[PDB]
Ligand binder design. Structure first.
Ligand code: BTI
Lengths: 526, 95, 526, 526
């Protein structure tokens, strides 16, 4: 019996209020800035490179993905901003590689395609990291991997950051071998030149497809990717006339995987939230100093804006409860202020509940600056904050993290930061991430100097202090920008707040391809 | 109610059988009918538009014409024979 | 019955030969250079810092380890050269942290001690990587972790390389939580100030020891590490008067772990090699262009110089066989020339044999430059080299890699490079590692330029080519030096060739603390 | 999404061609010969025996099966030709036993009924082998066994071939005990006299049914099968008035097994092949010297004549690909010429793919004579042919073999011969099986004699050679005939080519009653 009437979250914001008008205007500008920058990245290398690419009869990398996935199906692209201003004088749109999750023959798959128009498809250090992140996502969720291979090899000027280390180019083949041993299909389509060391990617794949004239595989047509590779050498499993033919063959290969998705969780009919998503612009804004009720964010992403809060009046700075997104059950943990001992205990209790019932967890990070409280006897927080860091780490249910505000210090770890292997991590265009907030850092620097100056007896003037402080503030702002963080692969993308519900729905759906394991906890330091 | 329109979806080349049988052994009988006339001997040189056979079907005369300028390898029917629809009438030497 | 007489490897080198005299002289100089540099690193921060450290009643970090481990037991230190010239103007001896494996109360444990004399114990980016490597070693071999905590927090000027990412400081607590859940004991001894974010390390530990006056734990004595932490807060499990008392308590804690080592492999009595180890100086030398028989190296490290070669006459450029080191069974794979299709097939067959019988694997990397062969139809090698990369990756037996020569290109991957998770990786002082050898790279660069110059029609003069080539050669030499590689944590240390047998014996003994699992292979592309 | 259009196999044969006319005529005669011989076997012992059997109020053995199975359901009879001309002067139609798979109460079961009209139901050596084969099929597929017991005991004149050995009559009870321990129901219905040693069959069954007046069980009515057996002795679980009543009771017993079939494989809607099956007569014919394209056979048995070929241009003498029969996924391996090194490698790769995805395998054996190639350096073939023999043996997916042509030498083993435990093995009426083809054998014999004659110096005349050769050719023809092979239980039946699709559909459906296990391979000798 599911006919019980229940209460719903959310309230109607005051559209006429000046605060709402200002917050909407600021957030809208950030979203528009995000959109137009992606448009530029969409063009890859440029008109001359794109014209040359098409002149050889090859499809553009994004057109290949469009033809590969099922007609009209959504495509979840990841790390669109990798390599954004990462290198001083070189522009590398998207890192030279396009990765995302789409549906092929009704099966969710991870698609990894080299962008040959960007530096001829050479592998920059960020390119390796982006690919390795994609492989990690595919393995953790048991998603078949499809490699649209068109590459020019490693970027020699930066070889030391590509070749040698464990998380360097060598790890790519290690991941392929491991996934194959686990029956996670590895499919490679050589749609262009495969350079030295990239010839392994077609070979290490379970099934392989090579284009007749364009494809070349060699550790050019005669040496590799030849009819020799297809027939005499036997490296090729399927022979394709052109790019369209190869993509058609790939869809057939996936259809023969003999795989059917099975769900471990209970399912209920989906319902839209009771409030518009675009109202999040006015509610949240771009000023991290102002505070908002995280429940408002929840009310606009969960099915029917229905939410069962757990321990509502205890540790109120943290909000935990049960909801459903697109029918899936989810346990939501979101910050609503500074973390306290009660908040950490409340979170630790909640995480155990979700792990016991095998319920996916969603974290909404919005940590607060220390301008309000200098110390507050933080020693008490240390004893309890660890209990949450330890429960979150050991949890085996799928975990997704969304940074809707600040993310500073140990608060990042307790809320399932990147270091704690959430299945996905997304950030809103207004976020900031740093070891500490910029102002606090300045104060700390100031005290040390003033006191040391005092030992010397030299006077640290008021002007002297300000001069010291300004560079520090600037560095922290520059390095906490959402773009700096996404340029390196610290998150899986910057998403428009109006798209939060859709992105979460796609992400949780993909994460459910793998069975949920039993959670084993360490010692809880009572 | 304004009208009817037909639009054709292009067929990918790969799906189209590559190298479909190319040689066609003479026009196939328009329908099942008696062969009333044969204008070609077992080995005869013919040019496109050379009448090969005349067939009457439900009282309607059809004249079969030479598809190619190739010499005739063989004839599958004689006069007075009833030929079924789409059955080969003439065999042409491979060139 | 084990009374059968068998043949033994090795031959007596010609000590009078000029080549042997030159090779011994060159290798000896490298070893002497290695020794004196370690002596300097042994001193840590310096006399002033060391004097200040002792003035507070605290033991020096290396004296702490000496008192912690069993009397007279050997100590296997790791990554002694981390941070060597890594940072432009800052000297960070050993990365500010000392890690190694020693015996405590008869149990092999991983010891991780902060060096407070180096930058006050602040965490540099290399410091985090060194600690994370130590934790990875402890988990893979089920070694209890002992943290001698005396730290000053993260190095703010380089925060972006310490805090945020998955392999950044946050991962340290994640590793502690995971090991605790697996019953791998985590013991923390706070022997000095624990700064913000380091207070978690005592809390996340299974058992904890704090010094009465020196120790402070706070997210100074009143705020944290107080009798408050020991009694009022309860974060402390044991209370110690001084450094000597704390080390005595630590030994008692380990003795109560209720752990006993069990061996999965057959054991035979140990025997010394039939040839002196120092002869390796003359045999190997420092010139990578000259070639030597790897069997000579094997004859001087295995018990009794006894070796059963597998497929001796097939793919002779690779040597594979069975031996024993300190009684443990080992399968040895070593390069003896350029890799061929037969060599890769022979290696793949051998690795399957060792995995089937649960025999540890040892790799001796000495890959050859392409000066001898420009291409040799390397396309054939690609089809087969992958079969070895794929077998080596999936092998679950303990793997140890020793680079006794060059390590270039895909040959590194096939011989269990760092990317393939060998339990340990060591390098001799004469090694070089790069994407390709320096000369080849220059040639490649030259061709591209000469041809492009030809399209322009501008003449690329002979002088022009040489000028282009010289910088490239220099870069490659600088970046392939054993010191560059060890300064970053790419290997676990640079070892004297005369110490090769001892280091391997200690490493394999530690690796046997974990049970050997069954190996699951992927698809072998026949 | 399954809306993609795909290519289909098959071509329209030239019905007017003389070759097609001749091939159809020859194959049709073989099929007609097969049909009329089965009609004679259908009559069992004969009119006098059948009249006597009915005069006692008992149903004829085949009428019992008709009433036992569900109304209108197909019945897959096995080894119809067992004992055909096997014994010099004794006619034993069907071996004195009828075995097959039919549906009882919606459950697929193995039915084993003694034919009392044939030698009074005595057990000939072939009778034991036929029953043991049926039990092996039931165990491998978890099919409940129903024994319609009406037997006269062992045939004393041939006791040495019935009683003593492991695969002799004793094994029948061993199989019953083993299947019972695995929860594979064993149901016995005593519908006639149970002789000495057959009394065990009712006793060893899980549930037992005995007819009131006809049934007798004793290690006649008073001694056994008495109301004594039903009540006083308790050997009988159910008491039946007549044959019709007993069959009705049997259906009730099966309905109470609490069994429901579960499928491990993905299912798609069934589709008929795009070409008539009877065209196989013209395409294949009866002349093994002529060659045909195996793809034509495939095009006329798979759903929609849809086939995805794997490695089409490599090792073209072997055809491998994926298809579906009645909705089930199947991997097909068929000979298209002499086996080569490439063909064996291609097969080994394909078999690993099917085992990884748990896809049933179908083999189409048509091996070629050595008239075309005397040796062709067959030593190369030995190194590779073993790789296929070893992969095929270890495969745990259900395997079905169909001999549509010759089956000679080691080619039989590589294509899953009887020795490799295929779930079912069928042969077309035109097949031949031998160690080598007859002609080759003659040549071999000729050479030995001619040379030995040369040592003597006695002249081996041309006539002498021919005289030697003729008997050998005759023996080989006689012993490779499909009837010789089926008379002994080497295959499960001779089937009309037009019935190939139906027989395969029934066989694969039965084989899916057991869960598919994971495949463990040995060492692949690379
Ligand atoms: O034979 C079928 C009806 C139409 C053809 C008959 C022709 S018409 C000329 C001639 N005059 C007749 O009355 N009948 C035939």
């Amino acid at each position: 019996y599911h006919g019980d009437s229940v209460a719903s979250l959310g309230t109607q914001p005051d559209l006429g209020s000046a605060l709402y008008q200002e917050n909407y205007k600021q957030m809208k500008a950030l979203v528009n800035q995000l959109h137009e920058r992606v448009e530029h990245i969409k063009l890859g290398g440029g008109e001359k490179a794109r014209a040359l690419h098409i002149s050889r009869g090859k499809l553009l990398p994004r057109e290949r993905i469009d033809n590969l996935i099922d007609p009209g199906s959504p495509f979840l692209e990841l790390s669109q901003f990798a390599g954004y201003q990462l290198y001083d004088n070189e522009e590398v749109p998207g890192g030279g590689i396009i990765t995302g999750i789409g549906r092929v023959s009704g099966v969710e798959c991870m698609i990894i395609a080299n962008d040959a128009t960007v530096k001829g498809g050479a592998y920059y250090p960020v390119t390796v990291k982006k690919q390795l992140r994609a492989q990690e996502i595919a393995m953790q969720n048991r998603l078949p991997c499809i490699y649209l291979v068109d590459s020019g090899g490693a970027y020699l000027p930066r070889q030391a950051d590509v070749f040698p280390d464990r998380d360097h180019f060598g790890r790519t083949f290690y991941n392929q071998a491991i996934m194959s041993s686990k029956n996670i299909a590895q499919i490679a389509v050589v749609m262009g030149s495969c350079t030295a060391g990239g010839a392994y990617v077609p070979a290490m794949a379970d099934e392989n497809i090579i284009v007749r004239k364009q494809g070349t595989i060699f550790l050019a047509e005669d040496l590799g990717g030849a009819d020799l590779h297809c027939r005499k050498s036997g490296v090729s499993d399927h022979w394709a006339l052109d790019d369209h033919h190869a993509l058609h063959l790939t869809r057939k290969v996936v259809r023969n995987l003999n795989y059917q998705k099975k769900l471990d969780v209970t399912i209920e009919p989906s319902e839209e939230p009771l409030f518009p998503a675009d109202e999040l612009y006015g509610i949240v804004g771009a000023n991290l100093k102002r505070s908002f009720d995280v429940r408002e964010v929840i009310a606009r992403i969960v099915d029917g804006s229905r939410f069962t809060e757990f321990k509502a009046f205890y540790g109120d700075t943290l909000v935990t409860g049960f909801a459903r997104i697109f029918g899936y059950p989810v346990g939501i943990v979101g910050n609503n202020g500074v973390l306290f001992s009660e908040s950490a205990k409340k979170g630790t209790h909640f995480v155990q509940l979700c792990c016991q019932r095998n319920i996916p967890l969603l974290f909404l990070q919005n940590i607060t600056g220390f301008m309000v409280g200098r110390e507050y006897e933080a020693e008490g927080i240390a004893k309890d904050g660890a209990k949450m860091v330890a429960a979150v780490a050991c949890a085996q249910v799928p975990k997704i993290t969304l940074i809707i505000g600040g993310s500073y210090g140990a608060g990042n770890y307790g809320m399932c930061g990147r270091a704690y292997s959430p299945r996905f991590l997304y950030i809103w265009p207004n976020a900031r991430i740093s070891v500490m907030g910029g102002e606090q850092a300045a104060n700390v620097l100031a005290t040390i100097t003033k006191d040391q100056r005092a030992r010397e007896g030299k006077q640290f003037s008021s002007a002297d202090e300000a001069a010291l402080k300004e560079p520090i503030i600037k560095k922290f702002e520059e390095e906490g920008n959402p773009y700096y963080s996404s340029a390196r692969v610290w998150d899986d993308g910057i998403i428009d707040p109006a798209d939060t519900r859709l992105v979460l729905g796609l992400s949780f759906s993909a994460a459910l391809n793998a069975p949920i394991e039993k959670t084993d906890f360490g010692i809880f330091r009572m | 109610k304004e009208g009817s329109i037909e639009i054709d979806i292009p067929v990918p080349k790969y799906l189209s059988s590559v190298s479909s049988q190319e040689t066609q052994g003479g026009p196939l009988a328009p329908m099942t009918g008696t062969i009333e006339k044969v204008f070609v001997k077992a080995g005869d040189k013919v040019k496109a538009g050379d009448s090969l056979m005349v067939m009457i079907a439900m009282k309607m005369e059809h004249t079969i014409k030479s598809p190619k300028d190739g010499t005739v390898k063989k004839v599958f029917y004689r006069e007075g024979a009833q030929a079924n629809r789409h059955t080969p009438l003439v065999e042409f030497e491979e060139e």
